[PDB]
Amino acid sequence: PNVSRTIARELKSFLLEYVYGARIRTLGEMNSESLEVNYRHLAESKAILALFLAKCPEEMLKIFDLVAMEATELHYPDYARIHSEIHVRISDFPTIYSLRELRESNLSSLVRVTGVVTRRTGVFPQLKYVKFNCLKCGSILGPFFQDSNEEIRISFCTNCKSKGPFRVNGEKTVYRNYQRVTLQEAPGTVPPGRLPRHREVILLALVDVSKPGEEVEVTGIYKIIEANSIKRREFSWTEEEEREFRKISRDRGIIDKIISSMAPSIYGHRDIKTAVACSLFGGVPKNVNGKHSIRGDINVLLLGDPGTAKSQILKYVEKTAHRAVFATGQGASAVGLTASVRKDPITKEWTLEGGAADKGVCLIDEFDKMNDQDRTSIHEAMEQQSISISKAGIVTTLQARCSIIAAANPNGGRYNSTLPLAQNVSLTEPILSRFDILCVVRDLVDEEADERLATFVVDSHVRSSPIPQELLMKYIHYARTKIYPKLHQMDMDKVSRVYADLRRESISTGSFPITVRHLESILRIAESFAKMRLSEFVSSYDLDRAIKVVVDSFVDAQKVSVRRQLRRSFAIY
Amino acid sequence: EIPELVPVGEMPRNLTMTCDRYLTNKVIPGTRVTIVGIYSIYRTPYIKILGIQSTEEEEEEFLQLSRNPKLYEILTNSIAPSIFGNEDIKKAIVCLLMGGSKKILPDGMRLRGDINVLLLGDPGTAKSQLLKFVEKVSPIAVYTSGKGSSAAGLTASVQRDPMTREFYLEGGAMVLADGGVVCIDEFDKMRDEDRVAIHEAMEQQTISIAKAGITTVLNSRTSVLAAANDFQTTILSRFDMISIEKMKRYITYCRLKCAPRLSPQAAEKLSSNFVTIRKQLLINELESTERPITIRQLEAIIRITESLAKLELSPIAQERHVDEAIRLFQASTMDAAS
Amino acid sequence: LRVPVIDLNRVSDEEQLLPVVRAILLQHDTFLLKNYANKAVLDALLAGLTTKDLPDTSQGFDANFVWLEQYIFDTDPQLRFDRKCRNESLCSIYSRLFKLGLFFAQLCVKSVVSSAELQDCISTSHYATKLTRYFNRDYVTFLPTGVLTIFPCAKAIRYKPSTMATTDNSWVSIDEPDCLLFHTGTLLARWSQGMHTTSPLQIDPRANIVSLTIWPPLTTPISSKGEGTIANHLLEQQIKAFPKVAQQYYPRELSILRLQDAMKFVKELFTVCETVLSLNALSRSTGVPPELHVLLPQISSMMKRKIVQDDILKLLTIWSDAYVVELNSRGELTMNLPKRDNLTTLTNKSRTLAFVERAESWYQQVI
């Protein structure tokens, strides 16, 4: 149509009257081909262009590249010798859709969707055109083939009129660059009972800038989604809820209220939920001059009798938290640590995908019942916050810095308290050393516990002071994405004095030692409590709760013969 | 291109070339090869080979530097610019390049000249920074790691030619290091199919391979300079120790020119040292400590003395090199005892 | 990242750099100055720490709460201005940076229509500097209140979403070691024919933002657009309007007579809201019934500030003839378009101008 000719000259006058000169000089000097245009800018200028981009973006994209190349040609001479075409990046889409709202009415239009990328393919062959060799007469014939069907069977020759066997000739054929990533819905925003959907995305002209296993925002057209723009930056906090969170965090020591708000179904005890809350709230990751990456996550390990609740609590924690997936699994396990390089049968190739939480928390149930692959993958992810892929022609180190909450059972049911935890569990010491907190429950008897536990669990079943659940789960996302509390060298050296007592007393009476990882763990627990307290820095008494958390985990993980250590730690209790 | 001089942000690139008829099979893969041809285009570039091959002031300044009596000492004050301490590790690293005295006996049972050196400790302390200097200093050496690396492997890799899925081989740092040393990092991360090959090549230099149509014994004059953090016997038994262009030219001229020997006057001190260490560690060994002392360590001491007497470009050895050799060996025995 | 780097050992005679400096501010308006003689006086910023004894009353330190003492340093010989703190080391760095500021003024305000009026700090000594000492969420976007401001800093750069330099509408930040950053004010952007910009600031590692401005006179004759409003009163209204004021009568009177002009954060909602409803009109042949839960994060992702029903209630209060407030059977607010076509850009431009005129009439009648 000639109506595009009055569209072209409109936006040609728009780019010289708005930041577009700085945008075109940055794409021209970086020899770049990506031009950035915000939707609000031209939408404030002309809403009819925004309506045309929302209705027919495929014919709207035939004007954009031409006027961008014309602006680059009169701004820079001979730019067509190196770069023939320059694309545009339509960002700032207001109506962000979900993957379950993708319907028949959203066809041939612009859509911004959130997701997680997996099984990414780079520069993998795509077909646009074909040819075919007819074997009977030995002739050539060719049509078209895009990116959705398998292939358009050709069975009728020109003059053979035969049903002979035909062969695929792609030795005169088109050149297609294909990078399709199977995007999935995030588990932190899926409704309960339903399953997350998945789609296939085409990436062209934007390959290997995306990270698998992370949240992503893609703006493209819907037909199979053909992505135009990618964004690796991304139930949220608002302005009306952020002032009341600081007002709630300033009054009445909210750490214990968050602990009491963690388990509404049962009474429990604070040793499981204190480790659970400090593991979900996490610490901060720090590096010195680009190296020495410390793990900011806290991996907790639960142990005890089978009757006691370990799965219900984990499930509740997962529901409460963002990007937390309860993978669990024993026999099912399959590919360990969600990271895998594998062949794919749809088009016969090699691909890499990190399964399903790079910032999230992964929940493992029945830790003692696994094979060699899923133990080694979680040992690599616990040793380092990354999983490397070094096969099928690809080498990629993906983020596996996810917190680990594992639950296990001992060999025989009973805890057998007259033996240490190393003889009790089947696991050894270096896989136990990655877990900083080892919480363990035991058995109990008198009327007191019978009067409280059964009444609280029957109160939880007869019904269909603490902090409410919605404000708590909004506070988790508000504190984990805005603050980073450091430490100041004013009086922190005193903990190096008390560690100097606490290390030495573990040799003379105990058998298992205390190392520098426990010091890193109590600094992470103290900064996690400072994160939950929403302070600027860690206080002096946060380390008191941190040393209490490490004493009732390490001393409780041993025999009854470390009983003198129950009173030896009473001076700092 | 040469991996000792390649920027750290990106892997080294490559080039494809076409070789004709008269120079076929004249180049073993893995050496310093100078190629002259035509840079043609098939867009993609390729090289048509038309020729193949592989300053007296340099030897004058090397002869002037060889006359310095504190030369060993400045060499050690030059291999460690920021490394604090560890002189015994530095001398053992700089003395494990050539190996020892290669002697071709008339009975056919020749002796091995190369040795083995192993780094061990906490992360840092240039365990992988001194390896870059030994990768860029030595004549033939290639940097690799434990269980191969990203799209490259120390072990003889095998995979599919993508044309119609063919089985073929990928030479690692083991066949390409013919006549030099090999240098790896992360010794604890080793696959079982590569450990048997390095287990045989660290003591026999030969690597044997046998599969579908290819059966071969590859010569691997490859000394090992590993770094680490049933494994106890392979660490404690298979390891003996637990300008720059002018230096490389002098190292190549010394490795090709001379073939030293040993005098009995300096060998009697070695015999007395062996008798005293066997008479002194037997108290610790009959006391059921179960940790050693062998003749292989004595042969390694002999190779260390041959390397120390070879560095001044001399075919004879004296007590001056054996007094530094027993001091180099005592730190390894103190590390092995505790 | 592309900041111009010059040397200071050859510009001491002032004969080789003026043309280049004039040329370089056409695209880049954040200058970096290195290698001066302040290598032993710059680390002496530990003297003026704990005074805390006088009230604000638009002079000296506005001591707001152990965390901030903003010294709005008034000038000495002008009327209604008298301020003298101790500040010996700060007097030495003020003398060196004031000579540096007059040096940059003589080398860069000579390429405009007036090269003797804008440097009138040489005669009357008109200086009201911002010594914001953040000693032991943050403050609003601060542009320099003078016409030229050179300051020692750690990073000193950010970018609010607008049509200015580094136009990508995101907060950009670079780090710079041992140097000074120059930024010019908004009066020089109106004096020079459109060649400047603005820059937001926050808590830097070198938290003492010693902003030493040129600060033009009480009676400087600005041109036709600003002949009635002087530089002193307008910039003093901006100076007393950005932080909190609770000390005396007049800036609190200026705050209650000037902070009700915040329609630009809600009328800009009217520059984008119809766009999205029209985007819902060209895609949903459902007769466009909207839901509040799906229209709220759309405009909350289109605009970084908080958007809740107070803005919808304010838009209903200012313009009720173009929208409905009709509730459905379920119990939520619904709102549609009264146009029979989808959208016409000329009618949309006329409706936006009428909304702007209605809000301007509301601003005139509210005061």
Side-chain angles (χ1 to χ4, degrees), chain A residues 151-152 154-164:
Chain A
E151 62 88 18
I152 294 169
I154 307 296
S155 178
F156 207 88
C157 182
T158 74
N159 47 1
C160 293
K161 271 66 180 176
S162 306
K163 295 305 174 187

Side-chain angles (χ1 to χ4, degrees), chain A residues 36 38-39 43-48 54-55 92-97 233 240, chain C residues 137 164 168-169 271-272 275-276 280 282-283 297 301-302 304 308 343 345 348-349:
Chain A
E36 302 287 331
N38 300 122
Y39 181 77
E44 189 263 332
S45 91
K46 262 178 287 302
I48 186 58
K55 206 189 181 192
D92 210 354
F93 204 56
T95 59
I96 301 173
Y97 276 97
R233 187 183 59 90
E240 57 96 19
Chain C
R137 188 62 259 170
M164 287 286 185
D168 304 283
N169 71 88
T271 63
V272 79
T275 78
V276 77
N280 288 125
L282 268 300
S283 299
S301 54
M302 201 53 171
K304 204 45 80 176
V308 278
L343 212 53
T345 177
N348 210 16
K349 271 158 195 299

Side-chain angles (χ1 to χ4, degrees), chain A residues 124-125 127-129 131-140 142-146 148-152 154-173 175 177 182-202 204-205 207-210 212-231 233-238 240-311 314-317 319-322 324-325 327 329 331-334 336 339-340 343-345 347-349 351 354-357 359-362 364 366-368 370-383 386 388-390:
Chain A
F124 275 97
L127 276 183
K128 301 302 184 304
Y129 295 149
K131 298 286 176 187
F132 287 86
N133 284 136
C134 156
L135 272 67
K136 286 301 298 181
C137 64
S139 299
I140 320 183
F144 170 97
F145 165 76
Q146 35 74 50
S148 64
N149 199 329
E150 166 52 58
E151 62 88 18
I152 294 169
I154 307 296
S155 178
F156 207 88
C157 182
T158 74
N159 47 1
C160 293
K161 271 66 180 176
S162 306
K163 295 305 174 187
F166 282 46
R167 281 314 171 194
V168 168
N169 208 344
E171 287 50 49
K172 328 178 194 59
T173 198
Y175 327 96
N177 299 169
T182 61
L183 76 152
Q184 217 188 348
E185 191 44 64
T189 174
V190 58
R194 282 189 186 90
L195 286 165
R197 299 286 195 257
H198 68 288
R199 297 291 190 177
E200 199 179 1
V201 78
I202 280 176
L204 62 80
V207 63
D208 65 82
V209 309
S210 66
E214 313 262 349
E215 287 212 1
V216 79
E217 279 261 22
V218 282
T219 83
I221 69 177
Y222 196 54
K223 50 174 60 159
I224 303 301
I225 320 178
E226 283 193 355
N228 186 22
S229 305
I230 195 149
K231 256 190 289 175
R233 187 183 59 90
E234 207 45 59
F235 194 70
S236 176
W237 51 272
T238 54
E240 57 96 19
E241 200 179 3
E242 65 180 346
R243 209 170 47 211
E244 78 170 1
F245 276 147
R246 320 257 303 166
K247 256 76 179 184
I248 278 171
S249 76
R250 184 61 261 172
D251 55 2
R252 293 182 183 174
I254 64 157
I255 169 74
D256 295 339
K257 211 162 273 288
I258 276 167
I259 291 313
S260 65
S261 308
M262 197 52 64
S265 168
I266 50 157
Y267 189 82
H269 60 106
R270 313 175 48 101
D271 214 346
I272 283 183
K273 43 199 201 276
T274 301
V276 156
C278 89
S279 65
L280 67 93
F281 264 98
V284 284
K286 278 187 95 71
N287 316 68
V288 175
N289 210 0
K291 63 190 183 299
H292 199 78
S293 177
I294 58 170
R295 169 187 81 256
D297 310 296
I298 292 98
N299 311 329
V300 291
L301 183 77
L302 301 174
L303 203 59
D305 21 3
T308 63
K310 274 84 60 188
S311 52
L314 86 76
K315 176 165 293 187
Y316 154 84
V317 155
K319 183 190 183 69
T320 299
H322 188 272
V325 159
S333 292
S340 48
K343 268 189 290 183
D344 193 283
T347 40
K348 195 175 190 304
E349 283 107 1
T351 75
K359 199 250 170 186
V361 173
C362 61
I364 310 173
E366 297 102 0
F367 203 65
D368 276 1
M370 275 94 82
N371 306 312
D372 292 333
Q373 40 265 41
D374 42 4
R375 180 178 293 170
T376 40
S377 295
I378 203 60
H379 175 232
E380 180 74 28
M382 268 188 301
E383 177 173 347
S386 87
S388 69
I389 61 171
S390 177

